[PDB]
């Protein structure tokens, strides 16, 4: 499956909130993946397993028309 992240927070509370709001524009599953990075923890708010290529341009047009980010393809 194909995953796209939207966002990346250092405040936890931000990538809770875009979690919340993306499931209002996808079906697909959306999570959060937080790592160290640099010091601090990141906080990827990412979407999928997505079945399709033509599946992912949908949603991130979707996303945009929400206004909620720049998706982007990433590979867990």
Same mark, same amino acid.
């Given at each position: 499956?194909?995953?796209?992240? *939207?966002? +990346?927070?250092?405040?936890? @509370?931000?990538?809770?909130? #875009?979690? +919340? ?8 599953? *959306?999570? &959060?993946?937080? /790592? ?8 990827? /708010?990412?979407?999928?397993? &997505?079945?399709?290529? @033509?599946? /992912?341009?949908?949603?991130? @047009?979707? &996303?945009? *028309?929400?206004?909620?980010?720049? %998706?982007? #393809? *990433?590979? %867990?």
């Amino acid at each position: 499956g194909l995953y796209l992240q *939207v966002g +990346a927070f250092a405040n936890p @509370d931000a990538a809770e909130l #875009l979690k +919340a709001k993306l499931s209002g524009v996808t079906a697909a599953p *959306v999570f &959060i993946s937080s /790592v160290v990075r640099n010091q601090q923890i990141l906080h990827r /708010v990412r979407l999928g397993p &997505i079945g399709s290529a @033509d599946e /992912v341009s949908r949603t991130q @047009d979707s &996303i945009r *028309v929400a206004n909620l980010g720049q %998706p982007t #393809l *990433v590979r %867990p």
